[PDB]
Amino acid sequence: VPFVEDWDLVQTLGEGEVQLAVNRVTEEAVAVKIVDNIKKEICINKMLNHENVVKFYGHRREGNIQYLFLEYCSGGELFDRIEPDIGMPEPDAQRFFHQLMAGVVYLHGIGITHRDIKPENLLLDERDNLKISDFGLATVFRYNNRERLLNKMCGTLPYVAPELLKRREFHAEPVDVWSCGIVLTAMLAGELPWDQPSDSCQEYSDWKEKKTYLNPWKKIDSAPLALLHKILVENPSARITIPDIKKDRWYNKPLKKGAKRPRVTS
Numbered sequence: 001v002p003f004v005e006d007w008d009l010v011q012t013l014g015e016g017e018v019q020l021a022v023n024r025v026t027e028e029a030v031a032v033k034i035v036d037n038i039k040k041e042i043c044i045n046k047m048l049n050h051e052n053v054v055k056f057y058g059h060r061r062e063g064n065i066q067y068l069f070l071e072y073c074s075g076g077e078l079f080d081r082i083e084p085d086i087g088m089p090e091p092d093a094q095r096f097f098h099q100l101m102a103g104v105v106y107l108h109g110i111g112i113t114h115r116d117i118k119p120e121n122l123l124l125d126e127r128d129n130l131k132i133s134d135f136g137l138a139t140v141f142r143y144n145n146r147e148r149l150l151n152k153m154c155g156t157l158p159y160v161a162p163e164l165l166k167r168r169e170f171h172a173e174p175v176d177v178w179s180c181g182i183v184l185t186a187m188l189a190g191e192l193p194w195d196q197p198s199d200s201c202q203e204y205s206d207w208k209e210k211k212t213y214l215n216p217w218k219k220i221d222s223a224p225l226a227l228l229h230k231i232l233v234e235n236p237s238a239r240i241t242i243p244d245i246k247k248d249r250w251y252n253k254p255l256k257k258g259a260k261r262p263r264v265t266s
């Protein structure tokens with residue numbers, strides 16, 4: 001069928017750059033990442049197949065410029081669903097957190113750590129389904145069933161686990177669990193608890209001193225706050241694992257009604 005391989009770039013999604021591409025014949029919308037770390041991003045993306053992970057369709061190398069064809073998420077970033085200093089309704093945050101856990105369980109199960117979980121990297125499709133995005137900082141932490149301890153410092157300071165700043169080596173999975181707890185905090189309070197998780201940071205000191213009468217903790221209900229108390233644990237070996245997050249009382253609390261299906265009366 002002619003012209004089916006032709007895509008028109010209609011708008012910038014990010015600044016290399018990301019463009020929204022529309023098929024000339026079928027009008028299918030895809031996201032194209034234009035990159036002038038890249039070899040590893042394509043390699044990790046070729047391993048991914050999950051409903052809460054941005055799908056990789058393929059790539060083209062036109063000289064030195066790499067084109068990555070990715071699943072288009074029309075709802076944009078989770079970041080823009082968070083009202084500053086307020087957050088979002090607790091049932092919405094719970095549903096987003098469930099979808100985030102399913103995606104992170106999937107990645108860890110195939111031995112991949114994202115290493116930069118934050119709301120800017122959590123995209124929403126047309127039905128508000130969360131998708132983990134950008135594998136440019138991602139790495140393999142388990143290969144041939146042998147875990148590899150990490151030592152590279154990466155991510156975003158408000159979302160990084162304290163062991164990345166204090167220890168030479170650290171396990172990959174508790175790092176991702178910690179950043180999911182900062183995401184949960186941001187969704188429930190609409191603010192980040194500290195600039196970085198260090199003893200020099202007063203906000204982080206207050207948290208370890210259990211001063212939950214201060215912001216952002218004062219805005220959060222006791223049931224999700226008890227979960228955050230188990231995630232935002234300084235010692236990564238004492239920190240709650242995802243199988244145990246799935247048994248938490250708030251995680252399993254019925255809060256949200258399903259999609260508003262059309263209905264008539266009489």
Ligand SMILES: COC(=O)Cc1ccc2c(c1)NC(=O)c1ccc(-c3cncn3C)cc1N2
Pocket residue numbers: 013014018031033070071072073074075076077080123133134
């Ligand atoms: C509220 O805004 C909207 O409704 C439009 C909008 C804005 C930003 C993004 C997207 C859609 N959707 C993507 O699929 C998308 C795809 C890729 C990227 C991206 C950004 N940095 C790396 N990557 C892979 C960003 C995206 N975000």
